[PDB]
Design a protein around this motif. Sequence first.
Motif, mmCIF file in Angstrom:
data_model
loop_
_atom_site.group_PDB
_atom_site.id
_atom_site.type_symbol
_atom_site.label_atom_id
_atom_site.label_comp_id
_atom_site.label_asym_id
_atom_site.label_seq_id
_atom_site.Cartn_x
_atom_site.Cartn_y
_atom_site.Cartn_z
ATOM 1 N N UNK A 15 -6.014 30.066 7.213
ATOM 2 C CA UNK A 15 -4.569 29.062 6.852
ATOM 3 C C UNK A 15 -4.779 27.937 6.986
ATOM 4 N N UNK A 39 8.009 -19.457 -10.174
ATOM 5 C CA UNK A 39 7.401 -19.173 -11.421
ATOM 6 C C UNK A 39 7.886 -19.554 -12.873
ATOM 7 N N UNK A 72 -0.559 10.283 -9.274
ATOM 8 C CA UNK A 72 0.664 9.881 -8.768
ATOM 9 C C UNK A 72 0.753 8.649 -7.821
ATOM 10 N N UNK A 73 0.620 8.986 -6.612
ATOM 11 C CA UNK A 73 1.394 8.144 -5.591
ATOM 12 C C UNK A 73 -0.033 6.956 -5.538
ATOM 13 N N UNK A 78 1.243 3.260 -8.932
ATOM 14 C CA UNK A 78 1.769 2.136 -9.062
ATOM 15 C C UNK A 78 1.631 1.069 -7.698
ATOM 16 N N UNK A 79 0.614 1.218 -7.320
ATOM 17 C CA UNK A 79 0.347 0.200 -7.245
ATOM 18 C C UNK A 79 -1.340 -0.140 -7.737
ATOM 19 N N UNK A 121 1.138 -2.646 -9.887
ATOM 20 C CA UNK A 121 1.678 -3.592 -9.251
ATOM 21 C C UNK A 121 0.111 -4.759 -9.237
ATOM 22 N N UNK A 147 0.131 -6.486 -12.318
ATOM 23 C CA UNK A 147 1.307 -7.371 -12.506
ATOM 24 C C UNK A 147 0.835 -8.472 -12.063
ATOM 25 N N UNK A 188 2.060 29.525 4.323
ATOM 26 C CA UNK A 188 1.717 28.723 3.786
ATOM 27 C C UNK A 188 2.673 28.654 2.520
ATOM 28 N N UNK A 205 5.399 9.361 0.810
ATOM 29 C CA UNK A 205 4.237 9.530 -0.492
ATOM 30 C C UNK A 205 5.067 9.442 -1.372
ATOM 31 N N UNK A 209 7.301 4.130 -5.456
ATOM 32 C CA UNK A 209 8.231 4.795 -6.144
ATOM 33 C C UNK A 209 10.058 3.560 -6.198
ATOM 34 N N UNK A 250 9.168 0.291 -7.057
ATOM 35 C CA UNK A 250 9.006 0.357 -8.267
ATOM 36 C C UNK A 250 10.604 -0.230 -8.375
ATOM 37 N N UNK A 278 8.429 14.222 -14.361
ATOM 38 C CA UNK A 278 7.875 14.806 -12.848
ATOM 39 C C UNK A 278 9.326 15.369 -12.070
#
Lengths: 147, 147, 49
Positions: free
Chosen positions: A19, A85, A123-124, A127-128, A131, A134, B23, B124, B128, B131, C39
């Motif tokens: 395991x 800006x 997901x993780x 966001x980058x 970004x 943007x 686990x 992790x 967010x 964001x 989520x």
Amino acid sequence: REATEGINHLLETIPQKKAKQETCQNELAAAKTSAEFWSNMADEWEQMVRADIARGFVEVVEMDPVKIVKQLESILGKYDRSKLNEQLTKTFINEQIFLTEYRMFEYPEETERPEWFSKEWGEYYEPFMNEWNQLQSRRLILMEYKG
Amino acid sequence: REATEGINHLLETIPQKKAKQETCQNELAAAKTSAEFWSNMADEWEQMVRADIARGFVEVVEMDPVKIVKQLESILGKYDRSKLNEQLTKTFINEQIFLTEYRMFEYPEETERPEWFSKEWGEYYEPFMNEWNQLQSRRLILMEYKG
Amino acid sequence: LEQLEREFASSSRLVNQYHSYNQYILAERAGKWQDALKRYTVAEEHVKG
């Protein structure tokens, strides 16, 4: 008795380590994913910074991100993107009162989204990617001067 | 023979299922942390939306995030945050010529960075919260009129 | 009346732009709320399983 003791201890240990190897393999796959993603992101930001330096608007000591950040630390401490800006737009509007004969005009310069953005990462990392989408847009100003 | 075979088989299987349970419980704890985090984040965003609707600048048909997006999603592909900000400022400066009597002024607003970001959610989740930090700020325009 | 006509036209321009901005902000925050709920529900399902 000795054989039974040994076999029992091994019977207990082997599943535990199996395991553990399972977890190690999962995390190693995750680490490889992260390494590739961040290698690509580092190359993309390198390409951006090399693009801006080419314009010659700002001179730098060397092509090292830490050195470049250190060179301009003051301004990062001083302003923030939204503020500059906004005030750049304000200055552009005001100063066209005087300079109109030069017929200024601005136009944002943009970089194509790298194709490798498609290779969904989860997901993780989303966001980058957002970004970068943007921040990749930047403004230019051009003025007609004696042809 | 059957009894000895059974005891040997159970000696093999029992540690295996104990490891599986180990686990499984680890993964369960991780998932519980994930669920708690997303509970707090979803409630924070709901509070954001309620606060913005309370301003009344836009009418909301059905207080449901999927419906609310469905009420406006066309705009999201119509504009982009930075571009919209720039054009809003461009309009705001020009119209400042006409409405001097009202004495327009624009000031920003910020929500209280939730304290529960302090809890050790782990790397992790950090993107967010970034964001949220970027998206939380908003601009408000106000005019002085009849006192 | 003429002065108010000009000022009302200017205010109409301003309010239309500001409404575009507010619509965009509300839509963006609603989308983020939607994703957060999605989520959360996925995570709660994972926990139950």
